[PDB]
Amino acid sequence: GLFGAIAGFIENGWEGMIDGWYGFRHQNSEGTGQAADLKSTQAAIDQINGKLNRVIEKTNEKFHQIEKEFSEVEGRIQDLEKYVEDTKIDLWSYNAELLVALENQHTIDLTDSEMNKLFEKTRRQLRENAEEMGNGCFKIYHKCDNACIESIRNGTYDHDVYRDEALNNRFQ
Amino acid sequence: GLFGAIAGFIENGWEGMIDGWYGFRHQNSEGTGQAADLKSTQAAIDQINGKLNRVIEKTNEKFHQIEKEFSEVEGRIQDLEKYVEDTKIDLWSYNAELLVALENQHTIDLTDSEMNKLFEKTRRQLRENAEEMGNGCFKIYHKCDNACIESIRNGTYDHDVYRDEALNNRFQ
Amino acid sequence: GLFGAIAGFIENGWEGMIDGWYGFRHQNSEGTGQAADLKSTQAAIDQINGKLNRVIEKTNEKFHQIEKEFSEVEGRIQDLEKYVEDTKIDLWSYNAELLVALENQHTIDLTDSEMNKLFEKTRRQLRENAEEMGNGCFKIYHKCDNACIESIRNGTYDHDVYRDEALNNRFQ
Amino acid sequence: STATLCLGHHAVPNGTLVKTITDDQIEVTNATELVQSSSTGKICNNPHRILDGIDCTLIDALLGDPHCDVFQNETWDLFVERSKAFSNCYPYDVPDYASLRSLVASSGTLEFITEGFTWTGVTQNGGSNACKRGPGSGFFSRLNWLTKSGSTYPVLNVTMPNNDNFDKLYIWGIHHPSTNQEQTSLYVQASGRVTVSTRRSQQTIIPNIGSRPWVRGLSSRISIYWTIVKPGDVLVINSNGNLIAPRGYFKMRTGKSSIMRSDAPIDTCISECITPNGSIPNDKPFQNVNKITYGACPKYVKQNTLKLATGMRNVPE
Amino acid sequence: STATLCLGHHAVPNGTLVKTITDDQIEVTNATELVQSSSTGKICNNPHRILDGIDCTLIDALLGDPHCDVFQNETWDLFVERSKAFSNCYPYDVPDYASLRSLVASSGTLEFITEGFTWTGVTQNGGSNACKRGPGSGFFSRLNWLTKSGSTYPVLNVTMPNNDNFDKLYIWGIHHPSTNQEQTSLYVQASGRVTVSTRRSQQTIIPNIGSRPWVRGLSSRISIYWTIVKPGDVLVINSNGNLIAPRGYFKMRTGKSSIMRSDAPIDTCISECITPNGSIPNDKPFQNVNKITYGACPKYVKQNTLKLATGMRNVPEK
Amino acid sequence: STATLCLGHHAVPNGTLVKTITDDQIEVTNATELVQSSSTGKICNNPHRILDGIDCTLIDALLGDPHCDVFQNETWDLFVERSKAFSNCYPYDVPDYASLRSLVASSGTLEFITEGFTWTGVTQNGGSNACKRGPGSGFFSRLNWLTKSGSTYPVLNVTMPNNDNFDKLYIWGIHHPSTNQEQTSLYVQASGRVTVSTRRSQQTIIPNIGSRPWVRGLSSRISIYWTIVKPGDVLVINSNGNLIAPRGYFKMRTGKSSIMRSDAPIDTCISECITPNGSIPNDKPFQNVNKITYGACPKYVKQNTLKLATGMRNVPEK
């Protein structure tokens, strides 16, 4: 994907995470846990439903058309009727093939994009208190309990609180 | 948008900015101010005009074609004449519908992209003298008067002039 | 392109890199050097081949069709026969024109993307030992001989080995 | 002491293969199908008015072949012709059969109004053993077989104005006898003629004596023609032998009506889209069932599957 | 001492909704319309040569119905047929009328050259009450109603070789009397015959006797037929009754000519694209005005509006 | 001490200009062409069965014009008609010629099978100096010209059932004499008739007497018709004069067969795709050579070039 996160710097997916599309796995003083991120899971699903509804949107109704099967050989005019329908089918088939190709390429890019959006959002929250290990994981340079992990997970984390502690472990 | 800048990590637009598409707001010891970025504004406008010219270009001319309205019931040949036109119309309609979907999606992504590009260009200039607050704002860690700000806006900011002062406020 | 790298924060390309699509130039105590990155070069090429194999695949075959040239004027049927063909051609030509436009826009974006992936991969390896000068170049803040350079190139660089040396030069 | 916070995304044991711009096959966590491949095999009788032709082609229903009498004045959104339909009355051919079938199919009604045609000097209501109603000979319900009366066949010449505000459709025909012995004993003159004209158009058909393959006892034939009379115009039928005359006219409607060749059973269920293989759901944009369709249908396509990715790329552990 | 630098983008109070791959409706700062849906209501007389048929159909002008004489030798890029048009000469049909209309429309000229047909032993210039030219009896200016001369109608049989380097269009016909009596008073023979042929092609019609509804007093009819003779080929006409002879040929050109049905007034302006509803501008790629068009026109489409975003997503302060 | 690591991408001196969504022309490192626009000029004789008609048209081969006798029972994947073809037997027209040409072309075989028609009371094998086989008079090899036998021509009324499990194609005809004399000398009846029927169809054609342009000595003509008999159906020919009877039937096949007009030389090579301009390769998705094609061909398109980018944007330092 264009962003390098899914099937990129994030080595692989988690079959263990059944409650969302994107999320956090941590390890601290209290042990190890795992939680889905709702906002980003929702962003991906919303856009995919958007795409989907737009393609499942009304067909067109047709009533009396031309005949398309023939029981006798006739010549000029039947050739024409066959060529018109054959041309139409080929054009629609081309349409359908291209459509899923564009859509799918795009679906993979946007999901890759959302994963990266979440990574960047976390990075920014953590400010000067964490470094990126380059595999999806941040190393947080301060003591950080389950309450603290959750403050990151729900975007209330106060970098100032932990700055001195973190700078010390980071640069000493 | 794929980059997460517009309608993303940058909460909203500025209706005040009537002199460009992208820009800067600052608050320094010498006051506040706002100014548009021309290069990025222009980058985005040039691409949109590009799209536009490419689609506004080249209607083709048809002269004698087939009849399309009929004043009596004829049967087989007229059914074909109608089916042919009906088919042509459904296909062009699908073309136009898809054309604007793709274009529009791409215009939103590219404008988003330009926003992000301006951010990243600015971040790069600042080097170690600033930190990224996480909402499109830099906390610049040193005295930056109006000329200092203007040197950022116009690409001439010399991070070395302030590196000492800044690192000092930033760590320690 | 959407990512700001090719014809972006990287001023320009290297006419002198004749053995890959991407890479490195460097300068350490041992002199200067140049080397292709094979993994990224290979990513771009593989995708471009995928695109190409998908367009150049699958000629459909047609046998008996309608006549498409006429020795004498006949009116209604011939009008239709010509309108049908003229319609088919215009639609196929629109398809063809649009296919290259999308494809090419995409090709330019993914190669721009790949350039940016390689930059990010590298930044990540260097952790706190390097700073970005904003033109595609890192300043590595420690003595980094040819084995050190090769280690960054092939993704085995150990930031821990040089961290103290680097932090010291970077801040004190 | 430090903490570790990893970011990730989900994966699944079994993912779906999907096409992109750059790959023929690439695994995603989830996809839906965009091509409808299957039918229940049954045509739903709602919400369209589906008229089962059973034993009859629409043309036989129009003409009024005795076994098709049920269809008098009938009406349809979609008339379904079954492959087993058979003709069982005087043998006939319709020049430009496909057009007549089309224009009637599209009108969507067999509503017939009988008119007071006066045929003075001829015997009306001719019948044949090729076409029985009940015990003895019979004929098309909607046609009137005119033969000599008292040894002469006058030159018939009759009028019918269209004083209504709709178009009338007249079906008529001409008789091709197989021998002059038949020709003369039926029509006196050795050479018949039929002229049927309006203010806007005219047709003259000449009988051709000669023998065709034996069908239901006959080597004769009846040929079928139509005339549409607009409001204000008038019909003139002029003939001195061989006329198969109209008994009146069919109303012509415009609307969503058509015709379809299918042997699929009709059942009680609701489906917008009809195909010769039976109704099909129309949730998906494309379909691979049949290029022949009626109603609100997906667009017929050559592929039998197109998967639309509905999740991210799948990367299993 | 420190500072704050914020990056951002613009917004407007008045967004425009637009469609994307993922959204039915999403607000952008600005957009432009891609479907032309409005018309002045008027066909511009430039740059296309517009011929208003006023009260004549092209066929009636071709045949030379008296009230359509103004049109002799006319030329057009677009022949505009008005719904007010009416026929006022002998009553007639044309089998395959649409085709004749098409081929003349496309040719774009009515240029007619008279030729010296010599009809030996018959009376020329028949005329009818159903087709008055001024005081009395008349007929189509381009057709010659032949009739018996002195109780005999011989087997007509004549040639006209095409010795030019263009195609000749011959218009001719056959007369369908109402009664056997009329048949014989006009042509003597109980049943007439017309055979028009070239080296490669041939048409042969017999007439149809029978009563029909009155049109301008007549129960009788004439059917119109046409023949194209290529350079180096020859016309052969052979009849022993009921021939409505040609008086010559129409020149045949190929070009951008066509025909259109419209009641739109003609006006003075420049507009490349014509439509029955009137001329329309062609700056936009698509149009919703009419599927029938002439010239450089946008492609007809079912949507009445398609917005192309021309600015970023609009995310307003408010 | 410090080090410098720079990241970059290649450039080339010879860029290619390409088209995108946002740019009319933009330079990439490399591109490939997607429109095939050239031909060798020659039709490869593999892998399709090519059959060069030389001086014959398919219809003339079908009917059996003497100089086209070579083609009896032939078979083709693609019959190639040359412009130098000429007709050299009795003068004829086929009402609905295009259709007969098309249906035989699609059948792909001239396989003819003689049947035992018995024509009680008429002379067979009529011939003419317009159609010489060898030195003396002749006729279409697959048609049988019937005339009077001993001053009478009785109402012919022959039958012939289809009992095979395949469709039969009958080619028959009718003769249009130039003069009333010629009619009676040949067929006795002053006015003739042909009626050909099955349970499904029937056709009656009535000859029309008169002069047509001189071709190979003749002012008269033959008109060609056709009937397809289904398994289980029966052919009934019935005529009191002027019949040009069939000798048997052609076998009808279905397959990938067709016909093409081209003056391009056949040649020993392999190409899947034929065009009247010659064979063309089919590696590229589109072509600009000819809208007329046969085989596995690129889609015809109006552009003569469409470049697909296969490298990044090109940005040399210079």
Ligand SMILES: CC(C)(C)c1cc(O)ccc1O
């Ligand atoms: C990849 C593409 C979408 C161009 C495509 C491939 C194909 O084999 C048939 C139709 C297509 O649109």
Ligand SMILES: CC(C)(C)c1cc(O)ccc1O
């Ligand atoms: C969004 C899409 C472009 C797939 C579409 C929707 C529609 O209602 C008709 C045609 C389309 O291509």
Ligand SMILES: CC(C)(C)c1cc(O)ccc1O
């Ligand atoms: C730019 C676009 C790809 C929409 C285009 C322009 C054109 O002149 C013909 C077809 C096209 O698809």
